[PDB]
Amino acid sequence: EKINSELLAMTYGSLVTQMLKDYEDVAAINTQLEKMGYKMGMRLIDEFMSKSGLSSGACREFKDTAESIAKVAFKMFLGINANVTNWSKDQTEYSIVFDENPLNDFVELPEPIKQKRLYYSNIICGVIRGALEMVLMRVECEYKKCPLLGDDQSEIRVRLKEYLRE
Amino acid sequence: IEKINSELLAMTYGSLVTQMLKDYEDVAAINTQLEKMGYKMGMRLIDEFMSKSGLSSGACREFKDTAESIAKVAFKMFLGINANVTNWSKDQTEYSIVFDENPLNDFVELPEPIKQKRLYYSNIICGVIRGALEMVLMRVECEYKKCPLLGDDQSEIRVRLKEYLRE
Numbered sequence A: 001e002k003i004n005s006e007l008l009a010m011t012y013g014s015l016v017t018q019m020l021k022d023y024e025d026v027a028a029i030n031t032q033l034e035k036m037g038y039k040m041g042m043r044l045i046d047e048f049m050s051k052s053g054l055s056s057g058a059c060r061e062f063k064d065t066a067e068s069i070a071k072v073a074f075k076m077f078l079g080i081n082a083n084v085t086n087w088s089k090d091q092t093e094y095s096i097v098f099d100e101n102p103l104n105d106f107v108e109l110p111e112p113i114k115q116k117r118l119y120y121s122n123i124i125c126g127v128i129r130g131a132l133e134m135v136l137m138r139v140e141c142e143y144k145k146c147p148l149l150g151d152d153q154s155e156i157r158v159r160l161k162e163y164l165r166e
Numbered sequence B: 001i002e003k004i005n006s007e008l009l010a011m012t013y014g015s016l017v018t019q020m021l022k023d024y025e026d027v028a029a030i031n032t033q034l035e036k037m038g039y040k041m042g043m044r045l046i047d048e049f050m051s052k053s054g055l056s057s058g059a060c061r062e063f064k065d066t067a068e069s070i071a072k073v074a075f076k077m078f079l080g081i082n083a084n085v086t087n088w089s090k091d092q093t094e095y096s097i098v099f100d101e102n103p104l105n106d107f108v109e110l111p112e113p114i115k116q117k118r119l120y121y122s123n124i125i126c127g128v129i130r131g132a133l134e135m136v137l138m139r140v141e142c143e144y145k146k147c148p149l150l151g152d153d154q155s156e157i158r159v160r161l162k163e164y165l166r167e
């Protein structure tokens, strides 16, 4: 709902504001926002699985995670419609692109923060990594494009590092 | 609202409190900054609440009216919490909002020295109340008095009217 989405956006906005006071190094902020999401995603995967109706085999292959994240997870948690593009030939990498992001609403980065490329929503990358670890996939996930930095759309890259064994 | 969105909000807020708790020696300042974050949010949120709640401007004429509006409508709409009003003052300028469950508190355990320092983990709620009511021209003071994370039997938030404001 819009009001709960506004409330989440403002809460996360308070977090990023706090990080900008507590850290002088934007790279450090990016790293900690991602580590914060990582812990969340390990806990969020259970809510996603139950409320999505997906089975374990919907998560057997790395290739399958693109549609689940872009078409289900993004709508469920952020109300965003995302698309999958830029597949690698070996299908170990894909990009998730989207033109809207409720966390970005009413946000304006000061010029030095833009030039140093803060990824305001970097927490999303951590959530993906932590969630996918729980279905036994170790991935790297990083932002490449964000309209707050003057880019034409948002793009997040997801790369498979290894399949895990329990 | 829905569990997955409420869990997601609880975890995002939890990362905020966790980041602030690095400043472990001035817990009072943490309480205050959490309130100021809520204060700014509540000024921005009040208009949306009025719209989704269907309340008119005259629904907010008297301070006594805010108690049911916050405890019974806002708390359900924003946190999924059912709350109750108690401990009215004789002149109806003070009431408390009491509740036994709080989704922001889920799976949270404060270390013993933080409990002794009386962190109010959910203090952002007090600021939301203060900022929202300012927009309907009430200057209020709103503080936590009891929280189960500190060993209390329930949550209690005190709301006190300081003055009716002028446009």
Ligand SMILES: *C(=O)CCCCCCCCCCCCCCC
Residues within 6 Å of the ligand: A012, A045, A048, A058, A059, A064, A065, A068, A069, A073, A074, A077, A078, A123, A124, A127, A128, A131, A132, A135, B008, B012
């Ligand atoms: C099998 O393929 C499992 C799918 C993994 C679900 C991933 C959920 C992540 C969605 C992004 C949520 C970002 C929330 C940010 C909060 C501030």
Ligand SMILES: *C(=O)CCCCCCCCCCCCCCC
Residues within 6 Å of the ligand: A007, A011, B013, B046, B049, B055, B059, B060, B061, B065, B066, B069, B070, B074, B075, B078, B079, B124, B125, B128, B129, B132, B133, B136
């Ligand atoms: C007229 O007097 C109407 C009363 C104003 C209602 C204000 C709504 C308060 C919202 C409380 C919930 C705080 C949410 C905390 C988010 C982390």
